[PDB]
Design a protein around this ligand. Structure first.
Ligand SMILES: CSc1cc2c(cc1NC(=O)N1CCC[C@H](C(N)=O)C1)CCC(=O)N2
Ligand SMILES: [Zn+2]
Length: 139
């Protein structure tokens, strides 16, 4: 589990979004596993606007933060699941690191702020849904 609170928005994994998220929907994209809903309070997370390929992520299955090198946002094949058929997920960045399904929502951050959230994993690899291109989260 896990979300990004910036301004009047809440950013979560689309496959984990609540009824409240869908009732206050701003934008969703199944191909990125992202959903953004509106909030009544002011979130204080800062979004990074950079091309960093190093950062730190929170791994709930280990109650620990891990430093990682990660790839640039790209289209990557993601095996079928209870939430989606087999498909290419866009804007995904991979890193060598531990992850388990309940780890989705863990934040990835660089020295410039929030980079994205855990969205995929499998065989000593963790995938992150990038959020740095969503310039409207700030405005
Ligand atoms: C960190 S998630 C994860 C971690 C692990 C495993 C599976 C997942 N599940 C995943 O990749 N999903 C399902 C949930 C929607 C995901 C999606 N974006 O379509 C795709 C298998 C065991 C393991 O070592 N790590
Ligand atoms: Zn950065």
């Amino acid at each position: 589990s896990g979300a990004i609170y910036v301004g009047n928005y809440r950013v979560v994994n689309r496959h984990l979004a609540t009824h409240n998220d869908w009732a206050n929907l701003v934008w969703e994209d199944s191909s990125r596993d992202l959903l953004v809903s509106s909030t009544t309070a002011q979130g204080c997370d800062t979004i990074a606007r950079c091309d960093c390929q190093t950062g730190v992520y929170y791994c709930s299955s280990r109650r620990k933060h891990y430093p990682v090198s990660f790839s640039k946002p790209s289209l990557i094949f993601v095996e079928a699941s209870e939430y989606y058929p087999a498909r290419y997920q866009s804007h995904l960045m991979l890193a060598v690191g531990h992850s388990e399904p309940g780890d989705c929502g863990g934040i990835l951050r660089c020295q410039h702020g929030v980079v994205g959230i855990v969205s995929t994993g499998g065989n000593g690899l963790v995938g992150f849904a990038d959020v740095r291109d969503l310039l409207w989260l700030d405005e």
